[PDB]
Design a protein around this ligand. Structure first.
Ligand SMILES: Nc1nc2c(ncn2[C@H]2C[C@H](O)[C@@H](COP(=O)(O)OP(=O)(O)OP(=O)(O)O)O2)c(=O)[nH]1
Length: 628
């Protein structure tokens, strides 16, 4: 019908009217700084939405091009950006639309499925590339991924989701969407009632495009209010370091890690054979064939029937790790514990990894999130890298690409140096500037020997005690923490002595603990002014938030610097777990790459920490599970 196809020539299809062609003159500035009168084509809704946000929008394709449209991009400082994609997998779908939103102008929309002239997008390439112009984005990581994959270079960025999360101070975990944020700040309802209609089809109806436009132009006023608001609370440093981290994160996402398929297969065979041997051995020990073995209740019943007791002649009621640690003087339970370990490992890693390896590229593309965790420390998803074990043989499955070499670098006691910095502890700094590790100092004071006389056992003891007491755990519970994460059995009197000696010398830690404990504060901050509020007091959280947040800030700045510094050599950033950064570089540029990473990490550390000096270790690794 003519009603439906009233604008078919320009790719638009009518559904419910509410669309009218309109033409008017736009007083732009010419390239020669001359007020030039040019008439443009722009659509509008018949029924005016109750919102005052801009709804006027151009649409650009092969035949509708006007060479003067790019003049809107001259002499701007901010533009509003929005894109849409048919699906969710960056490596299986195509971008559908690009939308630009400039102040006091209509939306500029490029219909990606009808831009066959590569010359049309030159202005877009300029605006994306220019470093002096800010781009406003919502969920900027997604759009940066989709643009970077498709040969688009973007330099500046200011994401609204980051600013909202930082402003909310981690009060709540949900929300932070365009509807929520616009209703929260600008006092307007977007009526986002579109249920994700199809996008594969070439043509687009009026409602889809109008919903798309309002989602773009609305970012300008939100930016104009949010920027001032963030300036009020002094969160500009963390916001700038976060926004600059979108592009390093996207590069990390799109690189991924290769996997040695052959070695993975061999490992799977060997581990399955060992697991089967262990299962047969436990079944022989369990004296049952139909025993489910995986079934906790049935194995508990089997142990009860066998009557495996404690040293105090007490029977097992539960097969948890802590309970299992108590019962160790039986071959049966030892074999059971071996089954627990082996099955946990196999099920967690080997049977689960293959579902994620992309057949087309033969890589694992982990998903990184940046503001989900309260500490600000990064996180992984789908294949969770924090869950991939640290075993050396297992970690060898991840190898660098063909004719390329890994360069693994990491800190060492970064959080301890950060704590010394923030608390202004005296002995700690006076030891660090003499180039001695805090573990060694603690071991020396503990053992009352000289520096050269400290062994590895006391070093491990100090390694435990430092983490135990720096974050203010009560003296009683210290035995459990060492048991849980180190396994050493400490005597209560010995632990009390350790606590007393520790707090007798380190005045700074005691002072900071006393101040924050008597204060009973609900708001805390880090050196990057990253503020967070707790609903009710938690001493452990109160002491743990500042240091961890600061270390997250240092690592984030290091990534941002490394992203820039490696583009002369074309080195790619791979992965970041805890306090490691891995890069790939072709072997022809190894020596320069090591120096570049050392410089970047050193400068990033030195920016915030201004009294103590951080030292980074780098090893030219052939695989992630390299000798250590
Ligand atoms: N003992 C211990 N320290 C941790 C852990 N997670 C973080 N840390 C802190 C201090 C670590 O040096 C760093 C984690 O990276 P590392 O490569 O140093 O781990 P790791 O303690 O295994 O180093 P190392 O065995 O001495 O080569 O962040 C943990 O789970 N256990």
């Amino acid at each position: 019908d003519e009603i439906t196809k009233k604008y078919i020539k320009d790719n638009i299809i009518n559904v419910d009217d509410n669309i009218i062609k309109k033409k008017d003159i736009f007083k732009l500035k010419n390239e020669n700084n001359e007020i030039t009168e040019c008439a443009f084509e722009y659509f509008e809704s018949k029924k005016k939405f109750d919102d005052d946000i801009e709804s006027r929008f151009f649409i650009i394709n092969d035949n509708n091009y006007n060479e003067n449209i790019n003049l809107i991009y001259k002499d701007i400082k901010y533009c509003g950006l929005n894109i849409q994609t048919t699906g969710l997998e960056v490596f299986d779908e195509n971008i559908r639309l690009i939308q630009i939103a400039v102040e006091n102008y209509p939306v500029i929309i490029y219909d990606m499925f009808n831009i066959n002239k590569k010359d049309i997008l030159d202005g877009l390439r300029k605006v994306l590339e220019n470093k002096n112009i800010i781009k406003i984005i919502q969920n900027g990581k997604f759009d940066a991924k989709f643009l970077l994959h498709n040969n688009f270079k973007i330099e500046n960025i200011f994401d609204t989701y980051i600013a909202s999360k930082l402003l909310d101070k981690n009060k709540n975990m949900y929300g932070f969407k365009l509807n929520n944020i616009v209703e929260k700040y600008l006092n307007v309802i977007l009526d986002k009632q579109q249920q994700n209609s199809v996008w594969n089809n070439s043509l687009l109806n009026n409602n889809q495009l109008f919903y798309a436009a309002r989602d773009s132009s609305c970012l300008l006023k939100l930016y104009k209010k949010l920027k001032e608001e963030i300036k009020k609370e002094n969160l500009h440093i963390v916001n700038d370091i976060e926004n600059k981290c979108i592009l390093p994160i996207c590069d990390m996402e799109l690189n991924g890690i290769k996997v040695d398929l052959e070695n993975l297969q061999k490992s799977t065979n060997e581990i399955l054979n060992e697991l089967n041997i262990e299962k047969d051995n436990l079944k022989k020990k369990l004296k049952d064939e139909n025993i489910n073995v995986n079934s906790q209740q049935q194995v508990l019943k089997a142990l009860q029937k066998n009557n495996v007791r404690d040293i105090s002649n007490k029977l097992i009621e539960n097969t948890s790790d802590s309970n299992l640690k108590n019962f160790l003087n039986h071959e049966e339970i030892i074999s059971l514990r071996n089954y627990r370990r082996l099955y946990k490992l196999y099920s967690a890693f080997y049977l689960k990894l293959p579902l994620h390896i992309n057949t087309k590229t033969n890589k694992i593309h982990t998903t990184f999130n940046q503001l989900k965790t309260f500490s600000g420390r990064f996180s992984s998803e789908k294949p969770n890298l924090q869950q991939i074990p640290r075993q050396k043989n297992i970690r060898e499955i991840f190898i660098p690409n063909d004719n390329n070499i890994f360069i693994i670098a990491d800190f060492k006691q970064i959080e301890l140096k950060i704590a010394a910095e923030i608390t202004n502890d005296e002995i700690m700094l006076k030891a660090y500037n003499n180039n001695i590790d805090l573990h060694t100092l603690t071991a020396s004071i503990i053992t009352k020997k000289n520096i050269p006389d400290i062994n590895k056992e006391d070093r491990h003891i100090a390694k435990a005690i430092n983490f135990g007491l720096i974050y203010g755990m009560n003296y009683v519970n210290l035995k459990n923490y060492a048991n849980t994460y180190y396994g050493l059995n400490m005597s209560l009197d010995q632990c009390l002595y350790f606590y007393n000696s520790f707090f007798e010398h380190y005045k700074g830690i005691y002072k900071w603990h006393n101040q924050v404990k008597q204060k009973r504060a609900l708001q805390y901050s880090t050196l990057s002014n990253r503020k967070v509020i707790f609903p009710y007091f938690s001493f452990t959280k109160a002491l743990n938030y500042p240091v961890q947040g600061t270390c997250a800030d240092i690592l984030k700045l290091a990534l941002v610097d490394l992203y820039d510094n490696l583009k002369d050599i074309n080195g790619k950033i791979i992965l970041c777990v805890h306090d490691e950064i891995i890069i790939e570089v072709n072997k022809k540029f190894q020596e320069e790459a090591l120096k570049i990473l050392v410089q970047s990490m050193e400068n990033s550390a030195s920016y915030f920490l201004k009294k103590v000096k951080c030292e980074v270790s780098v090893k030219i690794a052939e695989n992630w599970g390299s000798k250590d």
